[PDB]
Design a protein around this ligand. Sequence first.
Ligand SMILES: O=c1[nH]cnc2c1ncn2[C@@H]1O[C@H](COP(=O)(O)OP(=O)(O)OP(=O)(O)O)[C@@H](O)[C@H]1O
Ligand SMILES: O=c1[nH]cnc2c1ncn2[C@@H]1O[C@H](COP(=O)(O)OP(=O)(O)O)[C@@H](O)[C@H]1O
Ligand SMILES: O=c1[nH]cnc2c1ncn2[C@@H]1O[C@H](COP(=O)(O)OP(=O)(O)O)[C@@H](O)[C@H]1O
Lengths: 316, 300
Amino acid sequence: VKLFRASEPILSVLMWGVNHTINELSNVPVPVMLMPDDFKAYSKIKVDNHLFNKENLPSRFKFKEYCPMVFRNLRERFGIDDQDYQNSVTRSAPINRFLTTYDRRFVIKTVSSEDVAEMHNILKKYHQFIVECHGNTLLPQFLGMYRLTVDGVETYMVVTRNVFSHRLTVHRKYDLKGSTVAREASDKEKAKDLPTFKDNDFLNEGQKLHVGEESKKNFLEKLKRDVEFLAQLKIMDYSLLVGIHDVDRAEQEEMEVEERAPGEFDPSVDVYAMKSHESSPKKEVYFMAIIDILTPYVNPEQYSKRFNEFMSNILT
Amino acid sequence: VKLFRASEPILSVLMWGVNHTINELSNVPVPVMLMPDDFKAYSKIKVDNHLFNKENLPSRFKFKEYCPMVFRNLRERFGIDDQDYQNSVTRSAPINRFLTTYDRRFVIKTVSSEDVAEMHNILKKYHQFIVECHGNTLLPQFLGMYRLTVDGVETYMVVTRNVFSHRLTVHRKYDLKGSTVAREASDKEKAKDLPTFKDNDFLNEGQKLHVKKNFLEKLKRDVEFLAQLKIMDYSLLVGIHDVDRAFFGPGEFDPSVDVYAMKSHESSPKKEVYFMAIIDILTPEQYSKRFNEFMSNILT
Ligand SMILES: O=c1[nH]cnc2c1ncn2[C@@H]1O[C@H](COP(=O)(O)OP(=O)(O)OP(=O)(O)O)[C@@H](O)[C@H]1O
Ligand SMILES: O=c1[nH]cnc2c1ncn2[C@@H]1O[C@H](COP(=O)(O)OP(=O)(O)O)[C@@H](O)[C@H]1O
Ligand SMILES: O=c1[nH]cnc2c1ncn2[C@@H]1O[C@H](COP(=O)(O)OP(=O)(O)O)[C@@H](O)[C@H]1O
């Protein structure tokens, strides 16, 4: 029984819309393959109620889902049950433009019309890329894309698997581009609780991530083919997001919250999570992934190059 | 998996619509009471798919459900569970403007705009009457009313519980009206697979119905209410099934499902089951009197 209650009517329409589209997909059979028309398909519903069911939803609103058969196939290829996707968005309102599902599993980013067009233009090759690498990739893992209409204004939304763990807390984070230019977290930004540090906050701090050999080799191979993919698509401005989870600090914080009365993770769920080296000073867990992927076009050849040159020795 | 495969796309839309609106309703709490606005309310959905989910549904269509809280409450007062109603419409395409759900539990009637207007004009009083009589009535039991827009034309339909049994075959049907003019089955209608006899052929046949008293108690109350609301042109539908024609057994029926069925007396000549209920009440005080008199002289 789903009230769709949310801080804001637009979140309520989000919950309702994911519930509706997933339920409808339940009655659509799963095809042997995708056809080209699935990559320009869409489904739109326009709801005009009157004196009915307006406790939480607005009376009037629209919901459009893009290429639903494609994003369903992707969900499956990323190992995500449709039932679990629906439950994550609809059992309780997403929270704080960026949202997370209440269980911290998925990220919903508000984007623009141009981002949606870029997704359309790259979706066929992105789907082929996912299929050939079996979902093993640092790239964003796209799960759905929608357009809401609340009070006659459109809002585009992209759903991704969270880069960070859904259960391990991130204690520091960086956004890295390897741009030749200095990107530093502003003193205001660097005054947040969890500031988003940029490249030279990472440099001036002496940060190093130690994962040893096998995980390092996997990460560098993924990184090479991912950013070659982006560059071949003439895509720019993507960043590497890194979150540090301090295992010891978490253990202390949990003991402190319990006083008011493992260090492990599942890699089939936290698919960007890596453990610290065995001979490593502080038991740490790292979440590392490429983000901000829908901006086309100095040369993307050059951005690819500088990016990978920076990230290759982020860790050693 | 509810495919919505039907004989015509309007039936697919009907199926889809009932499915949709009932699921939505499962997410709407059931109130402690209905409110005035519940009798002025509707839900509207417009669907515009492109290259998607098009095997059995159309890609553009609209569905409108009138007063969904009132009709859900009515469903409850008539002892009909929402998932069973939904399964009777959506599990298989309705059949043959009058339709029947695949299981014959419910009939679906195409209707005019005028009659939708009339239903809105009577609905609060009708709901109150259903409350007071505890559902014990011969009136049509209204379970849902919808407008469907398919390929640009609107189609209004009203859903009722079947007057006839959903399993026992009917062997003779009569549409009694008690008029002071004479109605009779057309010679053309007389050559149908199951004629619809009207008033004069019951008299000129000699059919009587045998048993007991509480049925006239029900009928007079119903038709008094109809007249008090200035309604005319209703009929008493009567259907007769003969056991002897012919797992399950002869004359066997569930009174909770076939709510109008009634067994013949032991002093009946032939073993029969009757189904009798008032129908077509969407549109005077003399009509009540003549209708009731004629219905009076048909029991033994
Ligand atoms: O299938 C596609 N292949 C390529 N590109 C597409 C496709 N589908 C959408 N795009 C683009 O991605 C933005 C969508 O935005 P939208 O279409 O939801 O907005 P509408 O056009 O409906 O205008 P409206 O009357 O509702 O105000 C616009 O750049 C639109 O061209
Ligand atoms: O998956 C995520 N989990 C947690 N935070 C994220 C995630 N993705 C993005 N973010 C946060 O949003 C910031 C901006 O990301 P992104 O570059 O995609 O948005 P942008 O277009 O505003 O620059 C990230 O650097 C990070 O602070
Ligand atoms: O519940 C039903 N089950 C089976 N047939 C019905 C039922 N209700 C009505 N009918 C059939 O359709 C005919 C038309 O009924 P109704 O009086 O409601 O339409 P009308 O507006 O043309 O007079 C009935 O006389 C009977 O033949």
